[PDB]
Amino acid sequence: KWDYDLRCGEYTLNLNEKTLIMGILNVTPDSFSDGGSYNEVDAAVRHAKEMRDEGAHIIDIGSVEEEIKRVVPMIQAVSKEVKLPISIDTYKAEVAKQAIEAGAHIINDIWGAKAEPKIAEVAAHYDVPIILMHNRDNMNYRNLMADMIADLYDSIKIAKDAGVRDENIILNPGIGFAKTPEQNLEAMRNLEQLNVLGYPVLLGTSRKSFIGHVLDLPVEERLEGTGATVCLGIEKGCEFVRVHDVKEMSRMAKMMDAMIGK
Amino acid sequence: KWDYDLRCGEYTLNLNEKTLIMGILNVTPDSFSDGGSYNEVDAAVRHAKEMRDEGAHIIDIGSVEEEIKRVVPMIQAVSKEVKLPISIDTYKAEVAKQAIEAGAHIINDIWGAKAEPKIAEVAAHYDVPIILMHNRDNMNYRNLMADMIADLYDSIKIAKDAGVRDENIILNPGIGFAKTPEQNLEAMRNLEQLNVLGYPVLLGTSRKSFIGHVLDLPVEERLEGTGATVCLGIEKGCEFVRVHDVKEMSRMAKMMDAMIGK
Secondary structure, three states: OOOOEEEEOOEEEEOOOOOEEEEEOOOOOOOOOOOOOHHHHHHHHHHHHHHHHOOOOEEEEOOHHHHHHHHHHHHHHHHHHOOOOEEEOOOOHHHHHHHHHOOOOEEEEOOOOOOOOHHHHHHHHHOOOEEEEOOOOOOOOOOHHHHHHHHHHHHHHHHHHOOOOHHHEEEEOOOOOOOOHHHHHHHHHOHHHHHHHOOOEEEOOOOOHHHHHHHOOOHHHOHHHHHHHHHHHHHOOOOEEEEOOHHHHHHHHHHHHHHHOO | OOOOEEEEOOEEEEOOOOOEEEEEOOOOOOOOOOOOOHHHHHHHHHHHHHHHHOOOOEEEEOOHHHHHHHHHHHHHHHHHHOOOOEEEOOOOHHHHHHHHHOOOOEEEEOOOOOOOOHHHHHHHHHOOOEEEEOOOOOOOOOOHHHHHHHHHHHHHHHHHHOOOOHHHEEEEOOOOOOOOHHHHHHHHHOHHHHHHHOOOEEEOOOOOHHHHHHHOOOHHHOHHHHHHHHHHHHHOOOOEEEEOOHHHHHHHHHHHHHHHOO
């Protein structure tokens, strides 16, 4: 039902066999450096390794000058030591450029090319997939779903104008951003609508406020709630989920896949 | 959307506010008695209490002569010490009679009145809700879903003929019974069809072989897989889930409910 694969330079991701798991890398920085140090980069490599062991298919790694000094070294190490595609979690054009240069395969923009349109040009240039997330600096919606789909389309426009191929575009409803708890639930309820745009969807709900708002539970107690959102997401056609708890979420996805027939 | 409530003598269960959780009681018997002993009944009371604390709305308690001697004492204790409705998990008419006499509120038949039709008469008599599960002594299906719906309807017929009111009937697809792993998945995939019959559905997939078959994981490692089935089940309209891991499953249900708008 996807007539193509995701091309990620060295690695290739099939969109039909299974829900693809993107693991969120623990990024705890050192307080005694401006980036690159041994505890920093080593703790990140061991985390990537752990996530790779537990079922992850992608490792997600997230002022401007410092951001490069911190993130670049982590990409060099992980790409060497863990054979998995890497996404850079930035919205900044300059940051994205460095990260791909450093070895990152996918861009993960939380502003869907709206914060720094030049990022699209970076993406088209290096010919890497880009995840466009719904976002906005206000919460005033006429019709939440209709508006989201409009807003995302404004991102696709920017991406395509810059020269990004349809096949390198992935969408993200941006659950947990610019949405009240009730709005987040509504988007969850209506996720399948994003499918009409005809692009792979990545869901990213891992331990967010709205899960806490529902269950009344702090961040470290949101594995079950996250799981529910992952399940409903997969049912509604998501090609990727972005999660912290890779072992557990990887098992729920696999079971979902078997049931829905993916 | 349900224009009525479940009447359970002392307790009343609303079918619209939330997915109702039925907790599976640990029933470990004593090897030095034929039923009733202190370690037996006390370990069961503490388990019911634990499940009541973790979010359960119902406690499920499961030759003929001995079955009564073992199960009756557990119902007397739990109904006294835990203020929750109780279901007796039997298919035997004589057993069901005793259990309701002992204080059980709901019947949970794994043969949908087909093993002992008299059980329907017991249910109509005491005017208690009855859960009719799909089951059969063979695995030869022409059309799995079509056949299940036929078979269940043969149960409803028996129940109604015996005098059971429509409002005291609950259905159960019987996942994990008389079905190959692939058939179990198929039923999971097509669960919403059971809705056309117009009765509340209870799902009972807690840690079964097919979850293990998919994930390749032993019984004690099936919480995530169980969770996936609970999520998909709730999405497909289930009013109840029957589970071991009450704390976790209760949280996933609650989150599902918020998302689907229940």
